[PDB]
Each structure stands twice: as C-alpha cells, then as structure tokens.
Amino acid sequence: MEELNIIQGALELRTKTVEDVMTPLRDCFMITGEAILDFNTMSEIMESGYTRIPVFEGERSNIVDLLFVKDLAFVDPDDCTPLKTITKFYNHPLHFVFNDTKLDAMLEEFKKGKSHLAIVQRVNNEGEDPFYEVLGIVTLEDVIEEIIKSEILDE
Amino acid sequence: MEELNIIQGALELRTKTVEDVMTPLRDCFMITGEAILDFNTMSEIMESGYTRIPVFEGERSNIVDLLFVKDLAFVDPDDCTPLKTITKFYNHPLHFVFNDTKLDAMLEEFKKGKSHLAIVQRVNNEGEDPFYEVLGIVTLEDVIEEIIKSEILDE
C-alpha cells in the first residue's frame, strides 16, 4: 500500500526533533580558529566528508565561526592561508536551535536564510549560572536526508 | 482526518516537477555580469526580495554566474565594487536541471552539494542545431516552500 508508507513515513518524520537528527558535538568534525589551511589541514578536512564545519576557540563547545568546505574548493594548500583570513572575510553568522525543534520549524529557518549549519542547544541548569549547553550540530543536508529517507516524495 | 491531508499533500508534492515550481526566466530578477555594485544597483537587488540571482551576459538566457545576496550583506555600496570582482572571486558553479525533474531528485541534487539555484532547461528542437532552452530558475527555497505548503510535516 503506497498510502500507508506515505502516512507512516510522515508520522515518523513529524516525531523527530533536531536532537534526533544532529551529530553530537563529541562526534563532530571541528576545527580551531587558529588553523592554517596548509596541506595537512586541508587533507584532513577533505577526507572528513563534512561540507560544513564548526570553528571553535579553546573549547569545542565555544563555536565562533562556520567553515563551508565548498568555499574551500579554490583555496590552495601551498599558500597556507590562515583560516582566520577565510572566516573573517566571509563572517558567516551563527545559527542556534533549541534541542526540541521539529523538522518543519528547521526547514522554515533555513528557508528564512539562517545558516545551513545550526548549533543545537539545551538549557543546562546543573553547574556552578545556567547556560545553554551545546549538544551538537544539525545541517541542511541532515534534514534533507531525513526527508529522502522518509520516502514521502518517492514517486 | 490528519492522515488524508498527509496523503493528499504527498500525492500533490509527488506530481510536481521543477517546471511547476520554477520562476519563469521572463519573471526572474537578473543582473548583467558588467554590473557595478553601487547604491542604485544594490538597492534594486535588496528591494527585489530574491536571495539568489542569476548573472547573465548579453542575453538573459546566457547565464554565466550566480549571485547570492547573503554574500552581499557586507559589501559597501559606496566602494562601487564591480560584480565581476565578486563573481570571479567566489566562482560559484552553475547547476542545470531538466524541466521534468521531480522534487525528490531536486532535493537529492542540492544534498549532493550542487548549487542552490538551478537553471531549468528543456530541449528546443525548433530553430535554425537543437539547443537547451533556458525556461527559468528553481531554488532550494522554492522546493522547501513546496514542502512546507504541502503540510506533510505539520505536527
């Protein structure tokens, strides 16, 4: 039954939050703001498979910039351009989302123009001055991937 | 009935081609490759509402570059930077799609990393050496907008 697969795909899609879809921060490929885009660094980036990479300074949860790998397609490793030169040039804005955010809201935000890598946060009320704890990242491609896997659109 | 709305939304989504979703070329906001990003030009761009703009040279159907308005957020009108400086710097690659392409295939292409503005073509076999006729453009946001309008994801 085509219609039951559609229904069941949609029902599952609708129950998902960004927290279910995100890459946890511990698992994310990330890069220090002081990085130099020499061969070893760019090889590691290219070999990671990620196309959107958070840039942190000091602590991994301290994300200060984004790096979009497709923007690196024309950077030459042999010139060792500082990442800071790249990131300060583009200055792409940070996009934060609540861990309970549903995928429809996520779509709506990417459609409004917010950055295609979003940083997932929850409120942490357990240390000592409550803070927003960075849990992981979610990208445009992660959400599109859930839609394709849902098979809702499959002819 | 929640399930019937889902089914009917999906059935409609699935029947759509990029041709149904595209902005026709005649209706598109476009910009000449020789443009200077002075105030009048940037005002016109900002007032258009478009965030992705095809760059043409000579004829409107001769699209040679893309301009992403969010990349203009930090360009200063008073410096009159040539568009060519901007476009030759970024050099974003052109993405062409067949007019019969369905939305699931479209998603899959954007997810593979192809440019988020796609140029819709069909084969024109009526002039004189058949050529691919540019019909319009379709963006990431147009497809996301069809998904949101389908209400498939609505809680």
Swiss-Prot record, chains A, B:
Disulfide bonds: none
Highest taxon listed in the record's lineage: Eukaryota
All residue ranges annotated as the CBS domain in the record: 22-83, 90-155
Subcellular localization(s) per the UniProt record: Cell membrane
UniProt note on tissues of expression: Widely expressed. Expressed at higher level in brain, kidney and placenta, while it is weakly expressed in skeletal muscle. In the kidney, it is expressed in the distal convoluted tubule and the thick ascending limb of Henle loop.
Record: disease: Hypomagnesemia 6: A renal disease characterized by severely lowered serum magnesium levels in the absence of other electrolyte disturbances. Affected individuals show an inappropriately normal urinary magnesium excretion, demonstrating a defect in tubular reabsorption. Age of clinical onset is highly variable and some affected individuals are asymptomatic. Hypomagnesemia, seizures, and impaired intellectual development 1: A disease characterized by renal wasting of magnesium, low serum magnesium, seizures, and variable degrees of delayed psychomotor development.
Record's function text: Divalent metal cation transporter. Mediates transport of divalent metal cations in an order of Mg(2+) > Co(2+) > Mn(2+) > Sr(2+) > Ba(2+) > Cu(2+) > Fe(2+).
Note: Shares weak sequence similarity with the cyclin family, hence its name. However, it has no cyclin-like function in vivo.
Family: Belongs to the ACDP family.
Name the record gives this protein: Metal transporter CNNM2
